[PDB]
């Protein structure tokens, strides 16, 4: 939420996008289309798998410990054994609760970030040939058929080819 893309200027997600986390929808002279962006998708997945691998990193191995259940009342020493264990459990429970809260806050922000990064990358490709409509969409001011849209999706769009046509349409 901290970049304002997901659940922000992008109104909602696409349930019909099943082959990626992020991607492109277009409308042009030949129709409409949808395509997943694999690099941004993979960047967010790699980060989430990294944090998952860290959280499950290593299992403490413990053997003989102290007793934790008691059938007889004893007083002082049993009070201390119980207090030590209860103290330990409360602190680990705190660590677990905080860990998940921090990680989940960070996961929501990093995935929002990757969405924003793809948007900013696309904006920069388009240079003076498109305008940001404010809802995650670019209005592209020149004829842009399927190969042209494809060139934008794979980072090879040449803005100079269309600049004259786009400037003419943009400025009356």
């Amino acid at each position: 939420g901290i970049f304002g893309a997901i659940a922000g200027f992008i109104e909602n997600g696409w349930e019909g996008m099943v082959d990626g986390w992020y991607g492109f929808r277009h409308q042009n002279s030949e129709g409409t289309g949808q395509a997943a962006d694999l690099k941004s998708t993979q960047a967010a997945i790699d980060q989430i798998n990294g944090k998952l691998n860290r959280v499950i990193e290593k299992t403490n191995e413990k053997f003989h410990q102290i007793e934790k259940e008691f059938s007889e009342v004893e007083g002082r020493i049993q009070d201390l054994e119980k207090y030590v264990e209860d103290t330990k459990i409360d602190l680990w429970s705190y660590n677990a609760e905080l860990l998940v809260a921090l990680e989940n806050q960070h996961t929501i922000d990093l995935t929002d970030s990757e969405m924003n990064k793809l948007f900013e990358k696309t904006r920069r490709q388009l240079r003076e040939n498109a305008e940001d409509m404010g809802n995650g969409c670019f209005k592209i001011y020149h004829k842009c058929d399927n190969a042209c849209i494809g060139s934008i999706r794979n980072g090879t769009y040449d803005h100079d080819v269309y600049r004259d046509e786009a400037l003419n349409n943009r400025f009356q």
Binding site: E15, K68, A101, H142
Partner: protein, 317 residues
């Protein structure tokens, strides 16, 4: 004459709620569970060496209660004590039972080496109908009930040096007769004394004559004690009556062995983490099954669920 290009992200129809720093409940596309909350109910017999105590507590197998004879010289990573266990020999108590149970459990072995103590002047291998072994009156297999020979009980003064290179655990005891006639009949003298010493430590126990509640046929008791002897040190046993002598020593080891109270059955499977409820997987970092555990285990926490987000915020239309 133009086109529209929209950037966007996926969503799912079935999101899952997670907690964050700022939100008690926010929907993400997926999450994974971090708290292990279930068990199959079976203790896997691999990779740790499980010894099922069955009807025997560890202390009764140590002392040599007849129905525990099958545990002689046993080893374990985890000794499992069953709630149905019972004593069926001479009624006894262990001052600091918890500590002796612990140090034997942690040692992980009942390996016992007989030693030839010089009991000249007394009769050996006293028995009782409270502790039958087959057809005969008997006694704890690792203990030696000494009593008068030809109506005398001399001051016993015997020694056993530790000339090896490892520690020796000696289990010994004191007999508490229920009446003065028992005392004089067994030990001649009106009161006994047991002193077990090393170069650096000593224990003296004075028996106490009197009735205790009837248990397995008897109002008398025995009291169990223990002494560790390091290499180069010497055991010296000094008594003028009521001595329940050791027959030898237990080899003390260090390592990863322990003991667990559990009624869960043992199965053929492999699991690093054991709880009294049964073995549990250890792929999650936390668990809510039991604070009692053994092996490579998740950490016990009070929460029964903790969802780690593995996807973006879920924003459907």
């Amino acid at each position: 004459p133009g086109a529209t290009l929209c950037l966007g992200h996926h969503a799912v129809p079935n999101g899952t709620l997670v907690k964050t720093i700022t939100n008690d409940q926010i929907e993400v596309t997926n999450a994974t569970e971090l708290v292990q909350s279930s068990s199959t109910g079976r203790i896997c017999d691999s990779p740790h060496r499980i010894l099922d105590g069955k009807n025997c507590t560890l202390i009764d197998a140590l002392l040599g209660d007849p129905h525990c004879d099958g545990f002689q010289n046993e080893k374990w990573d985890l000794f499992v004590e069953r709630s149905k266990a019972f004593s069926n020999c001479y009624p006894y108590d262990v001052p600091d039972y918890a500590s002796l149970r612990s140090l034997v459990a942690s040692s992980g072995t009942l390996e016992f080496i007989n030693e030839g103590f010089n009991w000249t002047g007394v009769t050996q291998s006293g028995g009782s109908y409270a502790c039958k072994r087959g057809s005969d009156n008997s006694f704890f297999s690792r203990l030696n009930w000494l009593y008068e020979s030809e109506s005398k009980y001399p001051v016993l003064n015997v020694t056993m040096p530790n000339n090896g290179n490892f520690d020796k655990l000696y289990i010994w005891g004191v007999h508490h007769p229920s009446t003065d006639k028992e005392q004089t009949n067994l030990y001649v003298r009106a009161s006994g004394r047991v002193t077990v010493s090393t170069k650096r430590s000593q224990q003296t126990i004075i028996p106490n004559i009197g009735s205790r509640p009837w248990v397995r046929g008897l109002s008398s008791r025995i009291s169990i004690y223990w002494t560790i002897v390091k290499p180069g040190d010497i055991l010296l046993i000094n008594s003028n009556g009521n001595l329940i002598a050791p027959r030898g020593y237990f080899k003390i080891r260090t390592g990863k062995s322990s003991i667990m109270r559990s009624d869960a059955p043992i199965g053929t499977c492999s699991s690093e983490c054991i709880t009294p409820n049964g073995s549990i997987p250890n792929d999650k970092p936390f668990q809510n099954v039991n604070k009692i555990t053994y092996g490579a285990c998740p950490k016990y926490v009070k929460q029964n669920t903790l969802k780690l987000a593995t996807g973006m915020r879920n924003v459907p239309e």
